[PDB]
């Protein structure tokens, strides 16, 4: 690709790989979209750029302004990466439970860290960001409400898949729900082009909020917010697949050893659910899911420990 002027111009256009060994040929084809190929390392690259760009275009911020967000996962990495690339100051609130390695990653992009009591988890981090915003005029992208989050998947991720699976029909699309932006934006685009497509939401078995279950602690990082986000279209999906912590971890390990694809635990959940749907659909069908992050970001986690 011809040289670009800014690293943010590499965000998007992620590749798709067919699975050969963890899924038998007596099932549907399973393709995975490698969102960890985004320059910042996760699917969150897309929504970090979209929320910053929308506010930028709306005049809410200009370079030099500070961005504040309550995040302990890949949205903080994506925002710190985009903020450093585009000239914005970044402040992130997070519980004291966040690892020092993740703190070093955010500081490496020049972000500032404000720590909240660890026993309060994300609840404390969210409240601190609200005070920082409402009292200091900082812009909060608010990933769980901002329409730019599902819209960028509507504008890029979805059309990319239509582009990549041209001449073919996607019979089922599955995606793990964190903010729900991916499933909602992509599902809207795919259902318009493939009216008979099966859209399946993936959520932790240990925190199955979309199924009406009780929230709870889980290890599927990137998934299971404990609530139904405003950025999730709760009507886009036709079914839900719940995945346990052990099932997701073991599938991630299998895919790394047998496909050479090293992805995060939420990608193991997505691939496991896609393989179950592929067995259900049988040969000749096409199943597509999304791998939101790379396994190298979780080497200190039991996923590969």
């Amino acid at each position: 690709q011809k040289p670009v002027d800014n690293i943010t111009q590499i965000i998007g256009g992620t590749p798709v790989v067919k699975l050969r060994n963890v899924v038998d040929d007596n099932a549907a084809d399973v393709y995975v979209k490698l969102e960890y190929q985004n320059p910042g390392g996760s699917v969150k690259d897309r929504i970090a750029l979209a929320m910053i760009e929308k506010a930028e275009r709306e005049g809410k911020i200009k370079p030099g302004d500070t961005i504040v967000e309550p995040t302990s996962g890949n949205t903080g990495i994506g925002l710190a990466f985009v903020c450093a690339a585009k000239g914005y100051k970044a402040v992130f609130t997070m519980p004291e439970t966040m690892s020092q390695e993740r703190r070093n990653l955010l500081k490496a992009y020049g972000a500032e860290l404000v720590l909240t009591p660890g026993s309060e988890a994300m609840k404390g981090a969210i409240k601190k960001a609200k005070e920082l915003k409402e009292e200091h005029g900082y812009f909060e992208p608010q990933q769980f409400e901002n329409p730019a989050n599902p819209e960028v998947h509507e504008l890029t991720t979805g059309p990319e898949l239509l582009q990549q699976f041209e001449g073919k029909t996607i019979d089922a699309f599955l995606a793990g729900v964190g903010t729900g932006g991916t499933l909602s934006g992509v599902g809207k685009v795919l259902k318009k082009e493939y009216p008979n497509i099966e859209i399946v939401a993936i959520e932790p078995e240990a925190s199955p909020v979309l199924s009406g279950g009780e929230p709870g602690p889980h290890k599927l990082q990137g998934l299971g917010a404990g609530f139904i986000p405003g950025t999730l279209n709760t009507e886009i999906y036709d079914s839900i697949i719940k995945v346990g912590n052990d099932t997701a971890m073991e599938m991630s390990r299998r895919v790394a050893k047998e496909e050479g694809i090293l992805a995060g635990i939420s990608s193991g959940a997505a691939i496991y659910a896609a393989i179950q749907k592929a067995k259900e659909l049988g040969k000749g069908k096409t199943v597509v899911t999304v791998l939101p992050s790379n396994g190298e970001r979780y080497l200190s986690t039991p996923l590969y420990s």
Partner: peptide, 4 residues
């Protein structure tokens, strides 16, 4: 706790 969630990591999103």
């Amino acid at each position: 706790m969630f990591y999103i």
